[PDB]
Design a protein around this ligand. Structure first.
Ligand code: A1IK2
Ligand code: ZN
Ligand code: ZN
Ligand code: ZN
Ligand code: ZN
Length: 352
């Protein structure tokens, strides 16, 4: 099989003890997996085992202080879990949370190793909790450890430190944690598309504006594509890929592509309120397959409509497997955003 897939039910264990209906649901991953079964995709994929990230692997991106706190949650009584959760922006913690975050990251290391040692060409990682808001020193926005960031460092640690890794983050929210981790790094290109609303959208920071292009040797290696006003869908995202994502990615000529693949920009998503279709995410995946000789790992981030995320992610796996892609003027604010990013990134990317 040319595509690997990682899925472990143990990552369902993480749960919100006080709100069993919180939208970051255990069945996010089971619903995705079972849709893979329905669409006859599981039989085509090589099953990659999950495993725990080690603490030394976590230290690739996270402080020992942060690591320490999250690990301590394993032995906390309910009252302390509740207090600890409450110290961060939108986090719940149960006693299984730590183990699940380890699994999510280790699952992605195994997937990256599977791709880099030629076991598979590409892979999809059906994991939770998500990763991309987690910073070096703190959890945030349902995220404990930065799964995609760790995977990029892990990939470098088992090849060469200078391995060029692209992270495309198509979650509807900005990956503050990913940007910050790699903000002064030219070895990891970070590209994020995200609803912004001039700062009114989570995570509610100007860090996500198109003018944050990176720092030091990192200048040009942080691309933020912010949406302001309007339910963006397939047209805006395709246009963003044509004018920005792909021209820049091609020039960077990455050796591994990581997708921070939230499906919360999908039609039906209560959190995102956008309109990207499964076929849309299919075309995005197919386009990214033209980079790094096909060496793409798709990592689940957010996405809260169980039907939308299951149909979307399954469609991405279908494209990785090499199926044909399945079959509208832009909103104005989208043209505007694309044009602003083009201007901010012209200094760095001659493709633009
Ligand atoms: C009926 O319409 C609805 C509107 C909102 C919600 C809801 C549930 S919680 C939350 C929210 O926005 N919390 O703020 C934290 C965000 C972190 C995101 C995690 C991620 O996807 N990282 O990219 N919003 C539910 C229904
Ligand atoms: Zn990310
Ligand atoms: Zn994003
Ligand atoms: Zn960077
Ligand atoms: Zn999200």
């Amino acid at each position: 099989p040319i595509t690997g897939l990682v899925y472990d039910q143990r990552m369902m264990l993480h749960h919100n003890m006080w709100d069993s209906h919180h939208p970051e649901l255990p069945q996010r991953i089971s619903r995705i997996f079972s849709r893979h079964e329905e669409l006859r995709l599981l039989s085509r994929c090589h099953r990659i085992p999950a495993r725990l990230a080690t603490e030394e692997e976590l230290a690739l991106c996270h402080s020992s202080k942060h690591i320490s706190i999250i690990k301590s949650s394993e032995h906390m009584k309910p009252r302390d879990l509740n207090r600890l959760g409450d110290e961060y922006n939108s986090i719940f913690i149960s006693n299984e949370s730590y183990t699940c975050a380890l699994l999510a990251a280790g699952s992605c290391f195994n997937s990256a190793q599977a791709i880099l040692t030629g076991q598979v060409r590409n892979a999809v990682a059906i994991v939770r909790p998500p990763g991309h808001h987690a910073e070096k020193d703190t959890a945030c926005g349902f995220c404990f450890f930065n799964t995609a960031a760790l995977t990029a460092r892990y990939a470098q640690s088992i090849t060469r430190e200078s391995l060029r890794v692209l992270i495309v983050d198509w979650d509807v929210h900005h990956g503050n944690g990913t940007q910050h981790i790699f903000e002064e790094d030219d070895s990891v290109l970070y590209i994020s598309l995200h609803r912004y609303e001039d700062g009114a959208f989570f995570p509610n920071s100007e860090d996500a504006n198109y003018d944050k292009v990176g720092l030091g040797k990192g200048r040009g290696y942080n691309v933020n594509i912010p949406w302001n006003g309007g339910k963006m869908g397939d047209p805006e995202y395709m246009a963003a890929f044509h004018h920005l994502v792909m021209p820049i990615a091609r020039e960077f000529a990455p050796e591994l592509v990581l997708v921070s693949a939230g499906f919360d920009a999908a039609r039906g998503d209560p959190l995102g309120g956008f309109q990207v279709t499964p076929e849309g995410y299919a075309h995005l995946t197919h386009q990214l397959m033209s980079l790094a000789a096909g060496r793409v790992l798709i990592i689940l981030e957010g996405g809260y409509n169980l039907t939308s995320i299951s149909e979307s992610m399954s469609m991405c796996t279908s494209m990785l497997l090499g199926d044909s892609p399945p079959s509208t003027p832009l909103k104005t604010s989208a043209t505007v955003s694309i044009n602003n990013v083009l201007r901010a990134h012209a200094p760095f990317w001659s493709s633009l």
